[PDB]
Paper text:
Flcn is also known to have two paralogous binding partners, the Flcn interacting partners [name] and Fnip2, which interact independently with Flcn. This Flcn/Fnip (either Flcn/[name] or Flcn/Fnip2) complex has been recently reported to be involved in amino acid sensing through regulation of the Rag GTPases at the lysosomal membrane and therefore controlling signalling through mTORC1. With the motivation to understand more about the Flcn/Fnip complex, we sought to investigate their putative yeast orthologues Lst7 and [name]. We solved the structure of the [name] longin domain, thereby confirming it as a bona fide member of the [name] family. Additionally, we show that [name] interacts with Lst7, not through its longin domain but through its [name] domain, and we demonstrate that the Lst7/[name] complex exists as a 1 : 1 heterodimer.
In order to overcome this, the [name] longin domain from [name], a closely related budding yeast, was expressed, purified and crystallized. The [name] longin domain (aa 58–226) crystallized in the P42212 space group with four molecules in the asymmetric unit (AU). The final structure was determined at 2.14 Å resolution by molecular replacement of a higher resolution native dataset. Several loops were missing in the electron density, between β1–β2, β2–α1 and α1–β3, in addition to nine residues at the N-terminus and 13 residues at the C-terminus, most likely owing to their inherent flexibility. The structure reveals the classical architecture of a longin domain, which is the first domain of the complete [name] module. The domain is made up of a core five-strand β-sheet, with one short α-helix (α1) traversing the face of the concave side and the longer α2 and α3 packed against the convex side. An entirely novel feature, which is not present in any other previously determined longin domain structure, is the kinked helical extension to α2. ConSurf analysis of the structure identified two conserved surface regions of the [name] longin domain, which were mapped onto a surface representation of the [name] longin structure. The first patch (P1) mainly comprises residues from α1 and several that lie on the loop that precedes β3. The four molecules seen in the crystal structure do not represent a biologically relevant assembly, as an analytical ultracentrifugation experiment indicated that the protein was monomeric in solution.
Numbering used by the authors: 9 to 19, 28 to 39, 44 to 56, 58 to 144, 148 to 168
């Protein structure tokens, strides 16, 4: 089914932006949905958010995490899908959350490899490709 995968981080920089052939919305509106709220408490911790972009019939789910204990900078793995996937997305969430964990581990290992705090924006980066592949082969198929 169609999807848009954005990997981004705070310094905001977009590392990957991939829409499926099958599949939008402005990048500045997304930065706000991803890193933008007075309804949720900000804990400075690793988390998951699901938001409905009413203006586009889309649901956005985001894993956001820190490089490490000492860091104040966030990395986000965000995905847009049709809002009618929300029932399946919520039914299958323990599966999706576990796959997002692997994606989070993968990007963190890149940072460890390169002793850096920054993902490339011109990614032969196998770690970024591995995340795209996890969405293509595991997450999105489960959401049909």
């Amino acid at each position: 089914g169609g999807f848009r995968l954005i990997i981004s981080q705070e310094l905001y920089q977009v590392v990957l932006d991939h829409s499926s052939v099958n599949f939008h919305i402005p990048l500045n509106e997304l930065k706000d949905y991803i890193f933008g709220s007075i309804r949720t408490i900000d804990y400075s911790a690793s988390s998951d958010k699901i938001k409905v972009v009413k203006s586009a019939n889309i649901v956005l789910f985001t894993r956001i995490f820190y490089l490490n204990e000492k860091s104040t900078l966030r990395i986000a793995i965000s995905c847009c899908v049709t809002d009618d996937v929300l029932p399946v997305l919520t039914e299958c969430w323990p599966h999706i959350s576990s796959f997002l964990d692997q994606c989070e581990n993968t990007l963190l290992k890149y940072l460890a490899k390169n002793d850096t705090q920054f993902l490339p924006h011109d990614w032969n980066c196998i770690e970024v490709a591995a995340v795209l592949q996890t969405f293509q082969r595991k997450i999105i198929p489960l959401l049909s």
